């Protein structure tokens, strides 16, 4: 399955332990597009509808109406993982470059790669 | 449990699906140190001894003798994840800044954040 960075998919993240975000949920593809094209795995960030506002500097708000979600959500760039593509089902949307610039910043904060 | 970016720990990554790296194994802490201090989760990259040389630009070689491993290994910056700290057991070592600069580069390649 070929996916693209910026794509939002449903993925089954279960099973999990403790404070890991689990379940079948929207996730954001954050791996590079070479990996996304040739690798059997993708790297994704969990998205939650449990909150609507950022609590951490690794959170990016998704306005539901603007971005094609049912409900205002938050991308958790502190909740990331590499998944086999067989966990993926439906493509939900693709976030634009302005939104991805924010995700990039949050990802840098989450992994201590701040260059700005 | 307080961990530090650059620390190498054993973590139980199981269960997994498909091409996800699983088992109890050495992993590298790549999350920022605020998260590492106050969060119940850490973000880590899987390390493998199955290979000794980089096959991808997301791979970083660990010379066993230089860095305190039993065997020449490879850090897989394409195999990353957020884990509850309860998966962690033994601290193996702490990689120096010169090595972490290479890991940072590989992580940027893996997540399309190249700024160099």
Tab-separated table of C-alpha atoms in Angstrom:
chain	number	residue	atom	x	y	z
A	1	UNK	CA	0.000	0.000	0.000
A	2	UNK	CA	1.464	3.334	-1.073
A	3	UNK	CA	0.746	6.138	1.337
A	4	UNK	CA	1.969	9.732	1.417
A	5	UNK	CA	3.260	11.922	4.250
A	6	UNK	CA	0.373	14.164	5.353
A	7	UNK	CA	-2.206	11.413	4.721
A	8	UNK	CA	-4.614	10.569	7.565
A	9	UNK	CA	-5.738	6.942	7.841
A	10	UNK	CA	-7.546	4.711	10.253
A	11	UNK	CA	-5.072	2.287	11.850
A	12	UNK	CA	-5.500	-0.446	14.408
A	13	UNK	CA	-2.949	0.439	17.111
A	14	UNK	CA	-4.008	-2.318	19.570
A	15	UNK	CA	-2.948	-3.979	21.738
A	16	UNK	CA	-1.279	-1.397	24.014
A	17	UNK	CA	0.118	-0.997	27.471
A	18	UNK	CA	-0.458	1.706	30.075
A	19	UNK	CA	-0.470	5.241	28.606
A	20	UNK	CA	0.139	4.183	24.982
A	21	UNK	CA	-2.662	5.389	22.682
A	22	UNK	CA	-4.469	2.298	21.334
A	23	UNK	CA	-7.539	1.187	19.425
A	24	UNK	CA	-8.608	1.647	15.859
A	25	UNK	CA	-8.147	5.431	15.248
A	26	UNK	CA	-7.153	8.221	12.862
A	27	UNK	CA	-3.364	8.464	12.539
A	28	UNK	CA	-1.157	10.861	10.587
A	29	UNK	CA	1.554	9.514	8.264
A	30	UNK	CA	4.813	11.247	9.200
A	31	UNK	CA	7.394	9.000	7.552
A	32	UNK	CA	9.210	10.216	4.383
A	33	UNK	CA	7.673	9.291	1.031
A	34	UNK	CA	10.449	6.945	-0.107
A	35	UNK	CA	9.812	4.793	2.967
A	36	UNK	CA	6.063	5.268	2.447
A	37	UNK	CA	6.405	3.956	-1.098
A	38	UNK	CA	8.817	1.011	-0.797
A	39	UNK	CA	8.667	-0.067	2.845
A	40	UNK	CA	6.131	-2.482	4.355
A	41	UNK	CA	5.870	-0.122	7.329
A	42	UNK	CA	4.752	3.484	7.813
A	43	UNK	CA	5.469	5.841	10.755
A	44	UNK	CA	2.380	7.551	12.097
A	45	UNK	CA	1.224	9.850	14.925
A	46	UNK	CA	-1.962	9.056	16.881
A	47	UNK	CA	-4.879	11.507	16.634
A	48	UNK	CA	-7.401	11.868	19.487
A	49	UNK	CA	-10.881	13.436	19.774
A	50	UNK	CA	-10.763	13.192	23.566
A	51	UNK	CA	-9.428	16.735	23.661
A	52	UNK	CA	-9.854	19.685	21.308
A	53	UNK	CA	-7.133	22.012	22.614
A	54	UNK	CA	-3.365	21.432	22.853
A	55	UNK	CA	-2.169	20.547	26.352
A	56	UNK	CA	1.469	19.977	25.316
A	57	UNK	CA	3.798	21.686	22.801
A	58	UNK	CA	3.760	18.329	20.926
A	59	UNK	CA	0.022	18.750	20.215
A	60	UNK	CA	-1.441	20.187	17.022
A	61	UNK	CA	-5.163	21.111	16.878
A	62	UNK	CA	-7.281	19.980	13.941
A	63	UNK	CA	-10.284	22.134	13.238
A	64	UNK	CA	-12.867	19.548	12.095
A	65	UNK	CA	-14.596	21.742	9.535
A	66	UNK	CA	-11.381	23.009	7.951
A	67	UNK	CA	-9.675	19.617	7.630
A	68	UNK	CA	-12.382	17.005	6.977
A	69	UNK	CA	-12.806	15.439	10.456
A	70	UNK	CA	-16.140	14.722	12.137
A	71	UNK	CA	-14.974	16.436	15.377
A	72	UNK	CA	-12.277	18.877	16.560
A	73	UNK	CA	-9.247	16.748	17.300
A	74	UNK	CA	-5.618	16.859	18.349
A	75	UNK	CA	-2.570	15.256	16.720
A	76	UNK	CA	-0.293	13.752	19.394
A	77	UNK	CA	3.268	14.053	18.146
A	78	UNK	CA	4.373	12.492	21.453
A	79	UNK	CA	2.434	9.333	20.469
A	80	UNK	CA	4.227	8.020	17.446
A	81	UNK	CA	4.901	4.702	15.896
A	82	UNK	CA	6.070	2.467	13.163
A	83	UNK	CA	3.304	0.165	11.964
A	84	UNK	CA	3.030	-2.511	9.405
A	85	UNK	CA	0.737	-1.163	6.626
A	86	UNK	CA	-1.630	-4.101	7.185
A	87	UNK	CA	-2.920	-2.109	10.220
A	88	UNK	CA	-4.175	0.597	7.820
A	89	UNK	CA	-7.695	0.763	6.448
A	90	UNK	CA	-9.557	3.875	5.207
A	91	UNK	CA	-7.919	7.087	4.085
A	92	UNK	CA	-9.701	9.952	5.799
A	93	UNK	CA	-7.922	12.920	4.299
A	94	UNK	CA	-4.624	14.617	3.433
A	95	UNK	CA	-3.471	17.632	5.485
A	96	UNK	CA	-2.175	20.652	3.585
A	97	UNK	CA	1.356	22.070	3.815
A	98	UNK	CA	0.451	24.844	6.219
A	99	UNK	CA	-0.905	22.291	8.693
A	100	UNK	CA	2.098	19.958	8.101
A	101	UNK	CA	4.493	22.786	8.913
A	102	UNK	CA	2.880	22.833	12.382
A	103	UNK	CA	3.118	19.066	12.685
A	104	UNK	CA	6.807	19.302	11.690
A	105	UNK	CA	7.425	21.796	14.497
A	106	UNK	CA	5.628	19.663	17.053
A	107	UNK	CA	7.567	16.564	15.892
A	108	UNK	CA	10.822	18.488	16.324
A	109	UNK	CA	9.790	19.480	19.824
A	110	UNK	CA	8.767	15.865	20.620
A	111	UNK	CA	12.109	14.420	19.434
A	112	UNK	CA	14.415	17.291	20.489
A	113	UNK	CA	15.284	18.289	16.906
A	114	UNK	CA	14.232	21.960	17.216
A	115	UNK	CA	16.073	23.916	14.565
A	116	UNK	CA	14.021	27.119	14.705
B	1	UNK	CA	11.216	6.306	35.710
B	2	UNK	CA	13.370	9.207	34.546
B	3	UNK	CA	15.294	8.481	31.390
B	4	UNK	CA	17.456	10.721	29.216
B	5	UNK	CA	17.687	11.155	25.442
B	6	UNK	CA	20.709	9.147	24.255
B	7	UNK	CA	20.105	6.410	26.856
B	8	UNK	CA	19.930	2.803	25.610
B	9	UNK	CA	17.586	0.454	27.478
B	10	UNK	CA	16.111	-2.973	27.097
B	11	UNK	CA	12.401	-2.680	26.264
B	12	UNK	CA	9.741	-5.268	25.616
B	13	UNK	CA	8.294	-4.249	22.229
B	14	UNK	CA	5.984	-7.298	21.854
B	15	UNK	CA	3.480	-8.126	20.579
B	16	UNK	CA	3.976	-6.978	16.964
B	17	UNK	CA	2.555	-7.418	13.521
B	18	UNK	CA	4.267	-8.164	10.216
B	19	UNK	CA	7.491	-6.165	9.698
B	20	UNK	CA	7.353	-4.293	13.030
B	21	UNK	CA	10.476	-4.945	15.131
B	22	UNK	CA	9.388	-6.843	18.270
B	23	UNK	CA	10.710	-8.744	21.260
B	24	UNK	CA	12.666	-7.677	24.278
B	25	UNK	CA	15.587	-5.632	22.798
B	26	UNK	CA	17.937	-2.659	23.115
B	27	UNK	CA	16.173	0.588	22.186
B	28	UNK	CA	17.433	4.167	21.993
B	29	UNK	CA	15.561	6.960	23.797
B	30	UNK	CA	14.906	9.715	21.251
B	31	UNK	CA	12.201	11.746	22.976
B	32	UNK	CA	13.083	15.179	24.476
B	33	UNK	CA	14.134	15.267	28.129
B	34	UNK	CA	11.098	17.166	29.428
B	35	UNK	CA	8.865	14.371	28.129
B	36	UNK	CA	11.415	11.831	29.390
B	37	UNK	CA	11.199	13.360	32.857
B	38	UNK	CA	7.478	14.048	33.367
B	39	UNK	CA	5.670	11.752	30.934
B	40	UNK	CA	4.699	8.124	31.594
B	41	UNK	CA	5.864	7.321	28.061
B	42	UNK	CA	9.186	7.514	26.213
B	43	UNK	CA	9.829	7.501	22.431
B	44	UNK	CA	12.471	5.021	21.365
B	45	UNK	CA	14.113	3.559	18.236
B	46	UNK	CA	14.650	-0.212	17.918
B	47	UNK	CA	18.238	-1.506	17.750
B	48	UNK	CA	19.076	-4.770	15.939
B	49	UNK	CA	22.117	-7.094	15.923
B	50	UNK	CA	20.783	-8.947	12.884
B	51	UNK	CA	22.840	-6.644	10.691
B	52	UNK	CA	26.075	-4.753	11.306
B	53	UNK	CA	26.076	-2.389	8.317
B	54	UNK	CA	23.512	0.267	7.333
B	55	UNK	CA	21.170	-0.824	4.543
B	56	UNK	CA	19.047	2.357	4.642
B	57	UNK	CA	19.856	6.057	5.216
B	58	UNK	CA	17.751	5.721	8.416
B	59	UNK	CA	20.307	3.262	9.858
B	60	UNK	CA	23.143	4.192	12.203
B	61	UNK	CA	25.928	1.652	12.926
B	62	UNK	CA	27.012	1.000	16.503
B	63	UNK	CA	30.541	-0.248	16.881
B	64	UNK	CA	30.213	-2.677	19.823
B	65	UNK	CA	33.613	-1.992	21.351
B	66	UNK	CA	33.328	1.792	21.122
B	67	UNK	CA	29.811	2.063	22.563
B	68	UNK	CA	29.392	-0.713	25.150
B	69	UNK	CA	27.392	-3.324	23.169
B	70	UNK	CA	28.148	-7.050	23.083
B	71	UNK	CA	27.955	-7.087	19.241
B	72	UNK	CA	28.094	-4.641	16.305
B	73	UNK	CA	24.560	-3.381	15.876
B	74	UNK	CA	22.388	-0.980	13.926
B	75	UNK	CA	19.934	1.647	15.187
B	76	UNK	CA	16.753	1.592	13.072
B	77	UNK	CA	15.422	5.133	12.942
B	78	UNK	CA	12.648	3.819	10.666
B	79	UNK	CA	11.474	1.613	13.575
B	80	UNK	CA	10.324	4.034	16.201
B	81	UNK	CA	7.773	4.118	18.912
B	82	UNK	CA	6.148	5.567	21.927
B	83	UNK	CA	6.161	3.124	24.829
B	84	UNK	CA	4.917	3.184	28.327
B	85	UNK	CA	8.013	3.221	30.609
B	86	UNK	CA	6.807	0.001	32.260
B	87	UNK	CA	8.219	-1.781	29.149
B	88	UNK	CA	11.723	-0.612	30.159
B	89	UNK	CA	14.147	-2.667	32.209
B	90	UNK	CA	17.971	-2.399	32.236
B	91	UNK	CA	19.948	0.620	31.123
B	92	UNK	CA	22.692	-0.586	28.813
B	93	UNK	CA	24.508	2.640	28.090
B	94	UNK	CA	24.315	6.295	27.036
B	95	UNK	CA	25.496	7.303	23.540
B	96	UNK	CA	27.727	10.361	23.258
B	97	UNK	CA	26.876	13.561	21.371
B	98	UNK	CA	28.878	12.680	18.288
B	99	UNK	CA	26.887	9.463	17.885
B	100	UNK	CA	23.585	11.280	18.662
B	101	UNK	CA	24.299	13.810	15.927
B	102	UNK	CA	24.222	10.851	13.503
B	103	UNK	CA	21.024	9.517	15.031
B	104	UNK	CA	19.500	13.012	14.686
B	105	UNK	CA	20.343	13.036	10.975
B	106	UNK	CA	18.899	9.584	10.424
B	107	UNK	CA	15.727	10.557	12.348
B	108	UNK	CA	15.368	13.625	10.124
B	109	UNK	CA	15.717	11.455	7.047
B	110	UNK	CA	13.181	8.937	8.452
B	111	UNK	CA	10.567	11.637	9.188
B	112	UNK	CA	11.295	13.994	6.256
B	113	UNK	CA	12.634	16.801	8.474
B	114	UNK	CA	16.021	17.155	6.720
B	115	UNK	CA	17.328	20.624	7.424
B	116	UNK	CA	20.934	20.100	6.323
